[PDB]
Amino acid sequence: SGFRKMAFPSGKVEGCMVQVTCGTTTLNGLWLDDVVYCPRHVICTSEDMLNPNYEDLLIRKSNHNFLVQAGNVQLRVIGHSMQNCVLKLKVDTANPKTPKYKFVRIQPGQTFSVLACYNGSPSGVYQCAMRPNFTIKGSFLNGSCGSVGFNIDYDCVSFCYMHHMELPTGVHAGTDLEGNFYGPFVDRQTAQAAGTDTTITVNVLAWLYAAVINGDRWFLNRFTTTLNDFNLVAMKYNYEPLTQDHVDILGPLSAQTGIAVLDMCASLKELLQNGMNGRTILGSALLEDEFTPFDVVRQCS
Amino acid sequence: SGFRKMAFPSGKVEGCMVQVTCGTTTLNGLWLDDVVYCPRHVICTSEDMLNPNYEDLLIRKSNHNFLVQAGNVQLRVIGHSMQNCVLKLKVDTANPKTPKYKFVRIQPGQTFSVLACYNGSPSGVYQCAMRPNFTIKGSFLNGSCGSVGFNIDYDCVSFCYMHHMELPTGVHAGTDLEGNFYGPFVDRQTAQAAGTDTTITVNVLAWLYAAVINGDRWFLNRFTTTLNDFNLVAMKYNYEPLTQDHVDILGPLSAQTGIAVLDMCASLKELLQNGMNGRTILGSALLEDEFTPFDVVRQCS
Numbered sequence: 001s002g003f004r005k006m007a008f009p010s011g012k013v014e015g016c017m018v019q020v021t022c023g024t025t026t027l028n029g030l031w032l033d034d035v036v037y038c039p040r041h042v043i044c045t046s047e048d049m050l051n052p053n054y055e056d057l058l059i060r061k062s063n064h065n066f067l068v069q070a071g072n073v074q075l076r077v078i079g080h081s082m083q084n085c086v087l088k089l090k091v092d093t094a095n096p097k098t099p100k101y102k103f104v105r106i107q108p109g110q111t112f113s114v115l116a117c118y119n120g121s122p123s124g125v126y127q128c129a130m131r132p133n134f135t136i137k138g139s140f141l142n143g144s145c146g147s148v149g150f151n152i153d154y155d156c157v158s159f160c161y162m163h164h165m166e167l168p169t170g171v172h173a174g175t176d177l178e179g180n181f182y183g184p185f186v187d188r189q190t191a192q193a194a195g196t197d198t199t200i201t202v203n204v205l206a207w208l209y210a211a212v213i214n215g216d217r218w219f220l221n222r223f224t225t226t227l228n229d230f231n232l233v234a235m236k237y238n239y240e241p242l243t244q245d246h247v248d249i250l251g252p253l254s255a256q257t258g259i260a261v262l263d264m265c266a267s268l269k270e271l272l273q274n275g276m277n278g279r280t281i282l283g284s285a286l287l288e289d290e291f292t293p294f295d296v297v298r299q300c301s
Numbered sequence: 302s303g304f305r306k307m308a309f310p311s312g313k314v315e316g317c318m319v320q321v322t323c324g325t326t327t328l329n330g331l332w333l334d335d336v337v338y339c340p341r342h343v344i345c346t347s348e349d350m351l352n353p354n355y356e357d358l359l360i361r362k363s364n365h366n367f368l369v370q371a372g373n374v375q376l377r378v379i380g381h382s383m384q385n386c387v388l389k390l391k392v393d394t395a396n397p398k399t400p401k402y403k404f405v406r407i408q409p410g411q412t413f414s415v416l417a418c419y420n421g422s423p424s425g426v427y428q429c430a431m432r433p434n435f436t437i438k439g440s441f442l443n444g445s446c447g448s449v450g451f452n453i454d455y456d457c458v459s460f461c462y463m464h465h466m467e468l469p470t471g472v473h474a475g476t477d478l479e480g481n482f483y484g485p486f487v488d489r490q491t492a493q494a495a496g497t498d499t500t501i502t503v504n505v506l507a508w509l510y511a512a513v514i515n516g517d518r519w520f521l522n523r524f525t526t527t528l529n530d531f532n533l534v535a536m537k538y539n540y541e542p543l544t545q546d547h548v549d550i551l552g553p554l555s556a557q558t559g560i561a562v563l564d565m566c567a568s569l570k571e572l573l574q575n576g577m578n579g580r581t582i583l584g585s586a587l588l589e590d591e592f593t594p595f596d597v598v599r600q601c602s
């Protein structure tokens with residue numbers, strides 16, 4: 001029993017983290033096979049970051065200007081290319097610790113683990129969600145760029161995020177491992193406001209199922225609702241619309257608990273309308289939305 | 302910026318996890334040098350667990366009855382002993398992945414990372430605190446016993462917890478790596494009620510400092526208090542008494558923010574007395590107490 005915000009064990013990713021220095025900028029790189037992936041803004045001075053022309057900045061850079069250090073050993077850079085907002089540094093040595101891996105682009109509401117790193121050194125691991133506004137609410141200090149987000153499926157690491165920047169509101173933006181930003185964000189120190197941080201409804205319902213499985217049942221009520229009725233309430237409370245796809249994904253949790261998805265929606269509706277009245281659910285005084293239905297099944301199984 | 306519940310990177314501990322089977326019971330073991338540490342209740346049938354005599358049960362066990370598997374490779378058990386509530390299985394092979402390590406017995410209010418494992422396989426990592434009632438609020442299913450709690454200091458793993466059991470209230474009890482339970486708990490399936498789960502006041506204040514550092518300041522007020530006045534309020538709200546030792550430990554956070562510890566106590570006093578009024582602090586609607594002053598400095602530095 002018990003339900004915790006749980007990250008994937010980070011060992012397979014720790015084995016991939018390196019330090020990348022270009023001129024005076026140091027950040028983190030991901031070393032898979034004989035390629036090191038890092039944010040292209042490694043080539044920028046903080047001055048450059050105001051209006052960088054990355055193609056023009058990169059012309060002034062040679063392989064030997066990219067210093068790549070794996071622990072206390074230097075890697076030899078034999079090639080470099082820019083793909084979207086990441087640099088790919090070809091090194092002469094395949095990472096011997098390369099895990100089975102994929103690059104995936106996640107959808108908003110999907111959760112992943114972050115391995116926060118500084119100077120190529122793993123410093124902590126926490127669980128994130130891609131927010132509906134394509135930001136993440138991370139914990140990143142200067143030097144953390146190039147830290148990565150990932151899921152693990154048995155022995156296969158799916159990398160989904162590389163950290164690039166902090167918005168003035170202190171939320172985080174980054175890319176997939178093809179270097180495409182999540183959302184509208186750019187690797188430029190400019191006005192970039194995030195949109196509405198809506199609640200990931202399907203995740204909240206997953207977590208209410210987790211609560212029932214773990215003995216927290218006070219919020220279960222005598223009501224049901226419909227998707228359309230529930231969605232009127234969701235809209236009013238800046239919750240994501242619930243779709244039949246979401247209902248289908250919650251089917252196994254519905255089955256396990258014997259609570260129909262629409263009955264749980266009606267519980268969630270009353271919680272939105274009435275609040276918690278000073279009560280808690282799985283040790284939270286707010287409705288948690290950074291567990292996916294898959295996360296709840298995983299943790300509960 | 303941003304403040305997350307962060308675990309230590311788990312790689313160094315993943316390298317130590319093994320499967321231990323005795324008869325029909327499988328749980329996890331910790332392999333350091335040529336010793337495998339595991340809960341002694343590995344030798345119990347679920348029937349045994351009602352009133353086990355461990356010395357008598359252990360007489361019926363030989364080295365060859367302890368099956369120790371590290372990945373898909375069997376370790377040869379050449380000795381076994383019971384130390385308090387753990388078994389030490391001597392194997393013929395030193396764990397080649399043994400990190401620098403210590404065994405530490407933590408105090409209530411101290412935080413640590415748990416690597417939840419099943420069949421010797423790391424399944425997730427989360428951050429815990431030793432509660433003032435010597436329980437932890439974990440996430441452990443059947444098969445998770447022998448999962449461990451740890452802190453990391455650069456390259457040295459301090460192991461502080463091994464998981465042994467779940468109380469009927471769904472909170473968790475375990476030992477240090479010398480096999481001494483935290484608190485009054487025993488490895489017997491009997492009536493074991495936890496005492497008052499009081500709030501770790503010094504941790505709450507640490508986290509309020511973290512909030513200020515990260516731009517969440519709405520709860521700062523015009524008041525101060527004294528340790529004695531604050532402690533009258535703490536007692537009323539089932540908070541741990543704050544000592545001058547706690548004030549001294551918060552000194553660096555006080556210095557960094559320029560908020561006197563007793564001023565932050567007066568903020569905390571108003572939050573206890575007034576509640577959050579539907580507001581949040583670092584994304585929480587309750588006062589978080591599973592960050593130590595050391596955790597806040599670490600994450601903020």
Ligand SMILES: Cn1ccc(C(=O)NC[C@@H]2CCCO2)n1
Pocket residue numbers: 006007008009111127295298299300301417419424425426442
């Ligand atoms: C997102 N994430 C990573 C790990 C977990 C998790 O819940 N692990 C525990 C489960 C219990 C049984 C096997 O692993 N969730």
Ligand SMILES: Cn1ccc(C(=O)NC[C@@H]2CCCO2)n1
Pocket residue numbers: 116118123124125141307308309310412428596599600601602
């Ligand atoms: C308990 N714990 C484990 C890890 C952390 C943590 O906050 N790591 C991030 C820091 C930022 C700078 C270097 O590591 N806390």
